[PDB]
Ligand binder design. Structure first.
Ligand SMILES: N=C(N)N1CCCCC1
Lengths: 239, 10
């Protein structure tokens, strides 16, 4: 996260860190707990290995440097990548992770609310993006979970900034014209959440953009509302 | 995965 600030405990209790351990352990992506055994993230987080014994999923963690050998983590039972995701194209950048065991809910480990299958965001005037990603282009992972407040931008205005692609109704864009606040490398798969009437809810999944926090280059997010039929079908079927 | 995506190795 570029231009953000350090979060406090309980602000973002759905945020998870998706890490891999081979010989060394590293944070690769964000994710959102959406149910007691389900995490929602980006499909592109799995380009590279989908052999899921490598993954360690940390929840209830605000500061990564706080992680030790004894810190509990979740393992992966199943990975469900959207059947129409193609890495080169970038459409349908969404994936579900089923955990090997359900998690007990606490003030620091709770699911984010999901939108209904057909909303518009114009009530979403207060949106935030979180993660442990770089604080600048060619930066490094941040220890304390970062938060940043970013305005949503219309797909028409987003499309102007990206003539090379492809801005569909299944994407949502957010950013500042002057730049300086944005998601960045390591923030993939994490939440774009908006607060409405005192309830938070998941509007987007951090996906792509040109560089980080550049002027007139907003962040592009998978629009969760447009995949709610898919999310319901896959999780009900698997359960 | 392409340059525009945010995974570390994209
Ligand atoms: N929002 C931006 N800039 N991103 C999204 C996450 C991948 C890196 C680029």
């Amino acid at each position: 996260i570029v231009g953000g600030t350090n979060s406090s405990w309980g602000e973002w209790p759905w945020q998870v860190s998706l890490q891999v351990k081979l010989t060394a352990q590293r944070h690769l992506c964000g994710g959102s707990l959406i149910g007691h055994q389900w995490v929602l993230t980006a499909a592109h987080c799995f380009d590279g290995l989908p052999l899921q014994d490598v993954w360690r999923i940390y929840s209830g963690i605000l500061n990564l440097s706080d992680i030790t050998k004894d810190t509990p983590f979740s393992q992966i039972k199943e990975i469900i990548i959207h059947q129409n995701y193609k890495v080169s194209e970038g459409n349908h950048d969404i994936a579900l992770i089923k955990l090997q065991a359900p998690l007990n809910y606490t003030e620091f480990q709770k699911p984010i609310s999901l939108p209904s299958k057909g909303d518009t965001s114009t009530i979403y005037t207060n949106c935030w993006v979180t993660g442990w990603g770089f604080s600048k282009e060619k930066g490094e992972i941040q220890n304390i979970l970062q938060k940043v407040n970013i305005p949503l931008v219309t797909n028409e205005e987003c499309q102007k900034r990206y003539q090379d692609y492809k801005i569909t109704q299944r994407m949502v864009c957010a950013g500042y014209k002057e730049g300086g606040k944005d998601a960045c490398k390591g923030d993939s798969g994490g939440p774009l959440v908006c607060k409405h009437n005192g309830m938070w809810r998941l509007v987007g999944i951090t996906s792509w953009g040109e560089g980080c926090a550049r002027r007139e280059q907003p962040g592009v997010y998978t629009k969760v509302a447009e995949y709610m039929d898919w999310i319901l079908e896959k999780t009900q079927s698997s359960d | 995965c392409p340059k525009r995506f945010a995974a570390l190795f994209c």
